[PDB]
Design a protein around this ligand. Structure first.
Ligand code: HEM
Ligand code: SF4
Ligand code: SF4
Ligand code: SF4
Ligand code: F3S
Lengths: 1240, 219, 508
């Protein structure tokens, strides 16, 4: 009795202490069980998150998921390195909130209007394909549900009803227009491989389009493919610990790479110096030894000046033995460049090829693809490594300093200065004088002439020409005086020349003494340590229109100091977890390459620029981007015209591909008495068949069915939000500006024009998600999917070498299903619904010229447009490959659920190599069992996500030591050097799904990557190139400083140069037009990755919203806010020609005047009032952006500049954007609640 | 009438008394987590300082008066009554004002209303009523300044607490208003163990002599 | 002389990245219930700022902590026993819900149920978790000032800016910010325990964790005012107060707290500290507040001293705890290297959660500067965070101990760079700060590498001692409702018996 216990009062009094200040009591403490029983749980399950890569402990209590804490049992790193545990971040810690919250999607849902018509149609049409026809072909019916998008009316449906509608619509679209009119968008597969593969596999089997993501998000740094012929390979976070000098340039590490931040904070204790370069005082500055703040968008300038000081002091004045040898062996600096004749001066042309010389330097194979240089004895030579040795021959594609003819050791020379025949003056473009009124400029000359030590040579065709080295061209471009009395070269760092510290100080605002001190310290460290200097770079630089220059500026500094390929040094780019390591095990699964080849990949930026009709509002011209030394008449047309040409030349992919159903081509080729390939080539030449890109609005060349999963596309990722709503969805929109037609602008010369653009192109939008997102809100059908804690899958990252799983702690709640089971069931329904409409069809598929394939050696000297008679139409060389693919539609499900025969028939491979994988398939038959009968009888099964994962683990070299050894052996053929020793000591290694559930496993060194998985050295990008002499997949086989492609030269990007931020002209035409009484002001609009969410995921999570500002907000400097009369947290409106958004202000001192920042994505479903500008619900950050492509990101069929899914293509950069900002007056919620406010 | 009289003043007082005691004991042993004052101050501080102090200081004045007046030459019955009418009268005025302010708050202060329980509204309303009734008995006691009325009520009270039957007889002829006050007052003891009034049992007397630091040993 | 033990905690502010993971994991486990949804046992504040609750450091307004009277005796700032009792009907200093923030939620379901034919896109508006009514606008949150969110003149009201010419810090180029993660200090002389009229708050003898007994608490809500760190939160629904419980359910078996093991930055260290309970009053009542820091250090005992060992044994400290104390990272940082300092020692509570001050980028200067005593690395004098600010936070205004900690950390960096970059032994900076090569080496092991087994050295609370673990092992958790838990007397009105006990006594 607690009552009776009160009587043992003084009996429970123990000794006093501290001289009567305290009393020790011996009283009951049983009540403490109250908190103990909360902590206790049923079990713990290991899982992670899908779109950091951190393994978590999922706690289940009372049969429900209650919370999570990080797993800390990762394999430990070397004793001299800190370990990874516990990793994690705040977003991840709050995920459990989603499982049973109020915004959980529990049942499949369909727009009421669409359901009403669907059921009435089925009542009049027994066949679902015909029922769908009756609805979609009736303009009034189609529009009734397309306009209901985003306007409420969702009703509960069922898996049976939605699967039939989806299947019917898919069949109808494929049959009447083409498989490529069906598309799917899903991002970053590395976070949940199988979940991504599910939809991609269904789409690939039926012929639909698989949209890209690395370029779409603008996480892809085009400079990487340019310099190294590699999409993105970077050192792991642990490797930062091996660096003794680090610059965090435009990277907010603690906020964007949270679980890895400790390596940066901890390495400081080892003596490493850290420097932060960010316009604002960000979290990253808090952790550095020095904070430099240049004007945003002007970073390339600072890098150029730093490079200037490094070259001057470590390459010229006091030559660094390390640096000198490094650039000699690993760069294209010794390579020779042909000078082109102009009136009064010369211009750098394409690099000299062995084919240009009389006896082709004794080279019969691909002579026009082998660069040339001089050796220490003035003798000319074609060294090993150039991309010409990669195909057609074996044994010479390596970085051994040898003569490509005699196989003898040589020593390339760097500068011709001291052996030149004469001194020619070469012109270099200078853009540092242009720019808007928001950035400081430095007037010089559009063309800066420099004195270059040339050397005349006798060409193989009788003519003669002048040549120089990339090295000489580089020193000149930087403005280094070399005794030739060059007026434009600097005489000191104070001399305001083209690219001096004094010059940079004016443009960036960063003190010249700081630029000099750090450039010096950085280079000195690299020299002492042999390359242990590193630059971590992020979206602060990669999201600008000229991201290529910012990056090349940083890349050069690193190369000049020999930091690339050395542990603790190099280029560390982190923006998106693009690194799915078991690549060649996953690709066949994801794109059904085990059944059919090739698939239909497409680069999303061009795809949406085209189909959401953002080109109809383009304000940027190619003309204003051309070099001042280019023939402006050869580059006429709209930016979209350049894309269309790139497409027909086999440079970029297309989607839809042809203006005619590709399933009907074969049937016409037969009647014409000729095979499909030839019939297509001839029809294209004659114009009877055309690329769909030419007429995107004719009614048959736009996509009609779109699948969206693991994405919030139409709500955060989608640049040009208002355009997508208008043209793709056909719903109300907030666009403010007028299109080309309304302004009387000039129409493109490759694409048809019409005053009234086609609206509501999508017939059916299907979204899979566990929460009702902004995208679901605008969809026709919403499918409840399993959360990351309710399904099995795998995850890998570029931050560490571990492969770990996602696991179902409990079965998917309510009616949710995993992505794999959702698409498997769609496939099953499709397979029966298509009977009688589609059978064993023949498909004609176009495939752009592929990087890492023999065909990458397309057009060696210039650009020829067959469409303009400049050459013959040769598929795979001057146009895309024309492939024939057989599809067994009724067998879609059986193929989806089994590993195809192509793995055994053809084999497997990637990145330019192939191997036999029969043993792996035999193993898989035992692990997954096999089909007892039917079309896939005898083939390994793929019924569960686990089976799919084991397929990935068994086929990939990163997870199967047996395959890893065959992979390296195949590569050894090309290089003539043995590389199998890189995996022989792990040949018995085989990673299993159930084993990674017990403990994350480190992967195996693979030729797919250039870093190594070893116990003595950390993983560092480019390490195999520098240490195994494997060439970078570039024209020269070395790090490319000089881009000699015609377009690169004419657009002024052959060598790096400063390029000021571009003008989007999105503000002046709307500012003031719709006054509300408060002052308006134009500000630079920046959108860095937020702190309370991953893109938009978590943006609706109550925990994240509570720790943030309760919903969408925007940051402004105190000055700008005070100027506009904006107090902290006031409602404000941001807008321009592309649309408008509403948010609450966050006034802060750490935001520099002139700029505003709305952290990337806070989407459109929470706490947003009506807009005073559009009279609609306020928009989001992408309501004020719009896609604007850059020509150089379209180059194809040129060695390192050839296509690859997520490897190259146009990017959606938009930090150059400006918006009008103002305080809101009326705050109307448009919900009929009567709860509106007025700000005064 | 005679039946209702014996019920309310001979029977009822013992029913309410048993429920008050056994109910308190049982809720103490099996409801420790429910034994609190249930402060609402944080949700709405406005007016609470004035209101709560007026009510508690007043209600405590009343309690002291009632306790020593009904359960106890230099202090004859008529002197005791004069004290009750003025001292007790003033206390009841402070109490009633505070009580009314607290009730207004509890009923119309959004955060307090949204989070209150029914028993909280019921118990406070009844105390405001009981306090108002108490004050209304003053003009009646004024008609018998010789303490004739008080003598009856005190006769009843002491008969009840000493378990002497016939307690109702002492009340023969007392003004009706006194009847009401007595019944409502006893009812509050009946509802006592099922409301927030249990906080009263916990008046923190031990604190005045307690050592500052407390440490509990393994147990 | 009475030796007691406690697992202390040290947070290295130099490594904190201000991510809040620690805050989320605590919330998910302990405070997701209605009534404490607004409570964050662990919360991270960005400085400069006023924190959560707003201006909690202002004791003149909030009346938290202790004061030393002229006669030398200690008394809660709230007042003596009589004074405190006199404020019971309405605590005049009590922080209101608005001083924290009004907890909110959103109407997500409106996104699901919006009717067909809406004139605009449906949206989820905020709703109060206190009233259930629509909120016109969210005006506050627990981390509202995160990353300098707010005007400088607003953030500068920061109590720690006292006696500092703060004008210069409103200049863009002089901007500075740092993070202050905080939880309950589990003090040796807790003010909450002394200000609770019912005696419901207590310090556990075996591990020094301070708890509010949920059975005995009466909701007098005076403790909230009493705590100078404002770490006790009133549960508006249950009517009782709650606070960080140092995750005793895990500590009891030797595990780290949730916020410690989930710290992404790897900044938290857990280790045993042995202290003389008999010296608590003497130390907390020293006349000069700038001496409280050192006076508390003197209360901590040397775990390797055989004299302390024997007394500890005699006083009942388990052997494993003594052993844990001998390898305590907290002891090394607070006693040996002097890197860790208390949070506001002037409150006189003898706090047990300490902090290592943060380093920061050098201050803005006319030119790129020159090499200093540390070469290309910084010298303590160049740091942009005003040391006086750090001193007001950690050392009652005395900058000496703050500078020593920062200097020593920079020295470690200098020595390590010489070694790993130049390949030389250069102990110049070490000798300047009074450190040996071995000490810098150990500092590097714990601060840089920071292996899991080194950050957390938590011993068992030995729940078997002085109790009967066997019947408990066999019957704990069967919560059928025997009604016998919570009291020592066996008699009970419902005529029942404890499920986890043995009622049939041995007759042998
Ligand atoms: C069972 C409980 C109670 C009993 C038996 C009781 C009895 C009485 C009696 C007999 C009187 C008239 C005094 C006289 O003889 O002159 C009185 C007066 C009064 N009572 Fe009560 N009472 C009770 C409870 C309460 C409570 C709970 C309150 C407060 C809400 C209250 C407030 C008053 C006031 C304001 C007066 C008039 C002035 C005074 O005599 O102090 N009573 N009560
Ligand atoms: S969201 Fe990403 S970074 Fe955060 S805990 Fe999950 S996996 Fe790690
Ligand atoms: S010790 Fe435990 S209860 Fe206290 S703040 Fe940390 S996680 Fe929360
Ligand atoms: S988890 Fe660690 S690093 Fe992150 S805010 Fe909390 S204490 Fe700082
Ligand atoms: S002052 Fe003690 S509400 Fe605070 S511990 Fe609860 S009765």
């Amino acid at each position: 009795s607690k009552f009776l216990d009160r009587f043992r009062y003084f009996k429970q009094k123990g000794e006093t202490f501290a001289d009567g200040h305290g009393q020790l009591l011996n009283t009951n403490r049983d009540w403490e069980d109250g908190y103990r029983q909360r902590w206790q749980h049923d079990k713990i399950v290991r899982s992670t998150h899908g779109v950091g890569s951190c393994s978590w402990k999922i706690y289940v209590k009372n049969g429900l998921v209650t919370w999570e804490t990080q797993q800390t049992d990762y394999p430990r790193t070397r004793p001299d390195l800190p370990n990874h545990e516990p990793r994690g971040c705040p977003r991840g810690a709050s995920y459990s909130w989603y499982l049973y919250s109020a915004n959980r999607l529990k049942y499949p849902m369909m727009r009421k209007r669409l359901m009403k018509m669907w059921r009435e149609a089925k009542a009049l049409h027994s066949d679902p394909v015909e029922a769908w026809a009756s609805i979609i072909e009736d303009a009034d019916k189609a529009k009734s549900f397309k306009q209901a998008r985003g306007r409420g009316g969702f009703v509960r449906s069922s898996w049976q009803e939605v699967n039939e509608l989806i299947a019917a619509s898919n069949v109808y679209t494929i049959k009447n227009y083409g498989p490529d009119r069906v598309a799917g968008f899903s991002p970053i597969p590395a976070m949940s491989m199988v979940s991504y593969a599910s939809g991609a596999r269904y789409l690939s089997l039926i012929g639909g389009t698989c949209l890209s993501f690395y370029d779409w998000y603008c996480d892809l740094p085009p400079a990487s493919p340019q310099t190294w012929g590699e999409q993105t390979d970077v050192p792991e976070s642990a490797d930062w610990y091996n660096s003794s000098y680090i610059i965090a340039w435009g990277s907010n590490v603690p906020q964007t790479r949270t679980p890895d931040a400790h390596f940066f904070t901890e390495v400081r204790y080892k003596g490493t110096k850290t420097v932060a370069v960010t316009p604002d005082y960000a979290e990253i500055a808090k952790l550095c030894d020095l904070w430099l703040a240049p004007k945003q968008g002007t970073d390339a300038a600072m890098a150029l000046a730093m490079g200037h000081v490094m070259l001057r002091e470590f390459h010229l004045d006091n030559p660094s033995q390390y640096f000198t040898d490094y650039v000699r062996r690993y760069t294209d600096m010794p390579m020779l460049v042909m000078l082109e004749e102009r009136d009064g001066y010369y211009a750098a042309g394409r690099m000299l090829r062995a084919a240009d010389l009389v006896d082709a330097l004794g080279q019969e194979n691909n002579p026009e693809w082998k660069t040339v240089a001089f050796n220490t004895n003035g003798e000319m030579v074609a060294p090993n490594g150039s991309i010409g040795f990669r195909w057609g021959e074996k044994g010479k594609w390596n970085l051994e300093q040898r003569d490509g003819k005699t196989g003898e050791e040589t020593e390339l020379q760097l500068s011709l200065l001291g052996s030149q025949d004469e001194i020619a003056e070469v012109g270099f473009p200078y853009f540092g004088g242009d720019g808007t009124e928001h950035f400081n400029k430095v007037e010089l000359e559009n063309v800066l002439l420099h004195k270059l030590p040339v050397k005349r040579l006798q060409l193989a065709d009788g003519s003669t020409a002048l040549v120089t080295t990339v090295y000489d061209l580089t020193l000149a471009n930087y403005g280094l005086e070399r005794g030739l009395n060059d007026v434009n070269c600097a005489t000191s760092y104070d001399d305001v020349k083209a690219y001096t510290p004094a010059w940079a100080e004016q443009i960036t605002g960063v003190s010249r003494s700081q630029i000099i001190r750090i450039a010096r310290e950085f280079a000195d460290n690299a020299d002492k340590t042999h390359g242990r200097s590193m630059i971590i770079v992020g979206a602060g630089l990669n999201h600008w229109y000229h991201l290529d220059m910012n990056y090349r500026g940083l890349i050069n500094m690193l190369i000049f100091c020999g930091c690339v390929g050395q542990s603790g040094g190099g280029w560390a780019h982190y923006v998106g977890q693009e690194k799915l390591r078991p690549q060649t095990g996953w690709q066949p699964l994801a794109f059904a390459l085990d059944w059919q080849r090739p698939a239909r990949h497409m680069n999303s930026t061009s795809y949406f620029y085209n189909h959401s009709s953002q080109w109809r509002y383009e304000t940027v011209t190619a003309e204003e981007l051309l070099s001042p030394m280019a023939d402006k008449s050869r580059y006429t047309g709209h930016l979209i015209d350049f894309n269309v040409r790139a497409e027909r030349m086999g440079w970029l992919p297309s989607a839809p591909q042809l203006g005619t159903n590709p399933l009907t081509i074969a049937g016409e080729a037969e009647k014409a008495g000729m095979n499909p390939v030839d019939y297509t080539v001839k029809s294209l030449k004659e114009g009877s068949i055309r690329f769909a890109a030419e007429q995107p609005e004719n009614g048959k060349n736009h996509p009609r069915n779109l699948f969206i999963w693991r994405s919030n596309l139409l709500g955060s990722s989608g640049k040009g939000h208002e355009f997508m709503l208008k043209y793709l969805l056909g719903t109300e929109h907030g666009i403010q500006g007028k299109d080309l037609g309304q302004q009387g602008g000039v129409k493109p010369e490759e694409v048809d024009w019409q005053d009234n653009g086609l609206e509501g192109k999508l017939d059916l939008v299907v979204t899979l998600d566990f929460r009702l997102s902004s995208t679901c809100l605008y969809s026709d059908i919403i499918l409840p999917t399993a959360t990351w804690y309710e399904k099995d899958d795998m995850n890998t990252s570029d931050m560490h070498p571990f492969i770990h799983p996602l696991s179902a702690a409990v079965d998917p709640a309510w009616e949710a299903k995993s992505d794999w089971e959702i698409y498997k069931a769609i496939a099953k329904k499709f397979s029966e619904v298509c009977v009688g409409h589609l059978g064993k069809e023949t498909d004609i598929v176009t495939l752009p010229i592929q990087h890492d394939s023999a065909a990458e050696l397309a057009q060696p000297l210039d650009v020829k447009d067959w469409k303009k008679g400049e050459c013959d139409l040769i598929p795979g060389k001057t146009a895309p490959h024309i492939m024939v693919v057989e599809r067994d539609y009724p067998a879609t499900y059986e193929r989806f659920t089994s590993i195809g025969p192509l793995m055994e028939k053809i084999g497997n491979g990637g990145k330019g190599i192939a191997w036999n994988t029969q043993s792996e398939m035999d193993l898989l038959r035992k692990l997954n069992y096999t089909k007892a009968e039917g079309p896939a009888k005898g083939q390994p099964m793929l019924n569960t996500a686990i089976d799919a994962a084991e397929m990935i683990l068994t086929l990939a070299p990163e997870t199967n030591g047996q395959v890893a050894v065959k992979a390296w052996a195949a590569l050894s053929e090309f290089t003539g050097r043995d590389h199998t020793h890189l995996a022989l000591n792990k040949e018995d290694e085989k990673i299993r799904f159930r084993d990674i559930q017990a403990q994350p496993r480190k992967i195996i060194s693979s030729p797919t990557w250039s870093g190594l998985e070893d116990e003595h050295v950390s993983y560092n990008a480019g390490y195999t190139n520098v240490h195994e002499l494997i060439p970078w997949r570039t024209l020269s086989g070395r790090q490319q400083l000089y881009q000699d492609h015609q377009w690169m030269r004419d657009f002024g990007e052959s060598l790096l140069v400063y390029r000021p931020p571009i003008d989007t002209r999105s503000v002046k035409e709307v500012i003031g037009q719709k006054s509300n009484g408060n002052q308006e002001k134009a500000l630079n609009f920046l959108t860095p990755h937020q702190k309370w969410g991953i893109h938009s995921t978590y943006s609706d999570n109550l925990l994240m919203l509570t720790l943030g500002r309760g919903g969408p907000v925007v940051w402004l400097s105190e000055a700008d806010a005070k100027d506009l009369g904006i107090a902290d947290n006031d409602w404000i409106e941001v807008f321009n020609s592309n649309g408008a958004l509403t948010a609450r202000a966050v006034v802060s001192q750490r935001v520099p005047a002139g700029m505003t920042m709305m952290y990337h994505a806070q989407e459109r479903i929470v706490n947003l009032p009506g807009s005073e500008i559009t009279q609609q619900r306020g928009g989001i950050h992408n309501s004020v952006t719009r896609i604007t492509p850059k020509p150089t990101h379209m180059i194809g069929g040129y060695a390192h500049l050839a296509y690859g899914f997520n490897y190259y293509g146009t990017v959606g950069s938009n930090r150059d954007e400006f918006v009008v900002v103002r305080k809101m007056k009326n705050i109307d919620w448009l919900d009929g609640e009567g709860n509106d406010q007025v700000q005064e | 009438m005679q039946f209702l009289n014996m019920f309310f003043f001979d029977i009822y007082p013992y029913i309410a008394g048993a429920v008050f005691l056994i109910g308190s004991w049982l809720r103490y042993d099996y409801g420790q987590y429910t034994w609190r004052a249930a402060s609402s101050q944080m949700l709405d501080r406005k007016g609470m300082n004035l209101a709560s102090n007026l009510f508690h200081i007043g209600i405590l004045g009343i309690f002291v008066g009632h306790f020593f007046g009904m359960l106890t030459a230099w202090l004859p019955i008529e002197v005791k009554q004069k004290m009750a009418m003025f001292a007790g009268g003033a206390s009841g005025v402070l109490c009633l004002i505070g009580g009314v302010l607290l009730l207004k708050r509890r009923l119309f202060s959004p955060r307090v209303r949204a989070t209150t329980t029914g028993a909280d509204i019921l118990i406070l309303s009844l105390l405001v009523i009981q306090c108002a009734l108490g004050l209304l008995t003053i003009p009646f006691s004024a008609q018998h300044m010789d303490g004739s009325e008080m003598m009856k009520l005190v006769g009843w009270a002491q008969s009840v607490v000493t378990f002497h039957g016939g307690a109702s007889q002492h009340l023969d002829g007392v003004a009706f208003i006194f009847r009401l006050h007595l019944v409502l007052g006893m009812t509050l003891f009946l509802l006592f163990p099922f409301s927030r009034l249990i906080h009263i049992w916990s008046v923190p007397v031990e604190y005045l002599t307690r050592k500052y630091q407390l440490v509990r040993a393994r147990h | 002389m009475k030796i007691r033990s406690q697992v202390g905690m040290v947070l290295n502010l130099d490594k904190c990245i201000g991510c809040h993971t620690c805050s989320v994991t605590c919330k998910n486990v302990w405070t997701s219930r209605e009534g404490v949804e607004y409570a964050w046992f662990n919360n991270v504040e960005t400085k400069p700022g006023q924190g959560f609750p707003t201006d909690w450091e202002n004791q003149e307004k909030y009346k938290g902590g202790w004061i030393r009277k002229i006669n030398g005796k200690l008394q809660p700032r709230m007042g003596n026993r009589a004074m405190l009792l006199g404020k019971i009907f309405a605590n005049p200093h009590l922080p209101g819900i608005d001083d924290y923030y009004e907890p909110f939620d959103f109407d997500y379901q409106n996104l699901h149920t919006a009717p067909e034919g809406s004139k605009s896109q449906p949206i989820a508006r905020p709703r109060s978790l206190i009233t259930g009514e629509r909120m016109a606008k969210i005006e506050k949150g627990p981390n509202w000032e995160d990353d300098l969110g707010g005007e400088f003149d607003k953030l500068a009201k920061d109590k720690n800016f006292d006696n500092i010419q703060k004008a210069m810090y409103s200049q863009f180029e002089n901007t500075f910010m740092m993070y202050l993660p905080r939880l309950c200090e589990h003090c040796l002389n807790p003010a909450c325990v002394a200000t609770c009229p019912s005696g419901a708050i207590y310090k556990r003898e075996e591990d020094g964790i301070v708890l509010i007994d949920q059975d005995k608490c009466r909701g007098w809500r005076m403790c909230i005012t009493g705590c100078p760190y404002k770490k006790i939160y009133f549960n508006w629904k249950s009517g009782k107060s709650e606070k960080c419980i140092f995750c005793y359910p895990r500590i009891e078996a030797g595990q780290p707290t949730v916020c410690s093991e989930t710290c992404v930055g790897r900044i938290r260290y857990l280790g045993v500290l042995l202290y003389d309970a008999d010296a608590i009053e003497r130390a907390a009542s020293t006349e000069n507040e700038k001496d409280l820091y050192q006076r508390q250090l003197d209360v901590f005992l040397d775990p390797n001293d055989p004299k302390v060992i024997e007394q500890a044994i005699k006083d009942g400290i388990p052997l494993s705890v003594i052993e844990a104390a001998q390898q305590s990272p907290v002891y090394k940082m607070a006693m040996e290297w002097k890197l860790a300092l208390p949070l506001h020692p002037e409150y006189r509570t003898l706090p047990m959660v300490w902090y290592v001050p943060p380093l920061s980028p050098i201050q803005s200067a006319a030119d790129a500067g020159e090499l200093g005593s540390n070469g290309i690395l910084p010298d303590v004098e160049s740091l942009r965070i005003p040391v006086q600010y750090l001193a007001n936070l950690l050392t009652a205004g005395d900058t000496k101990p703050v500078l020593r900690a920062l200097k020593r950390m920079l020295a470690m960096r200098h020595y390590k760079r010489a070694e790993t970059v130049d390949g030389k032994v250069d102990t110049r900076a070490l000798e300047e700060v009074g450190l040996t090569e071995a000490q810098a080496q150990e500092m590097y092991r714990y601060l840089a590498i920071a292996n899991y087994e080194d950050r957390f050295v938590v011993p068992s609370s030995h729940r078997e001692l002085a109790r009967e673990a066997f019947p408990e092992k066999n019957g704990c958790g069967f919560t059928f409702g025997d009604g016998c838990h919570g009291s020592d007397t066996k008699f009970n009105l419902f005529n029942s018996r404890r499920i986890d006990a043995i009622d049939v006594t041995s007759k042998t």
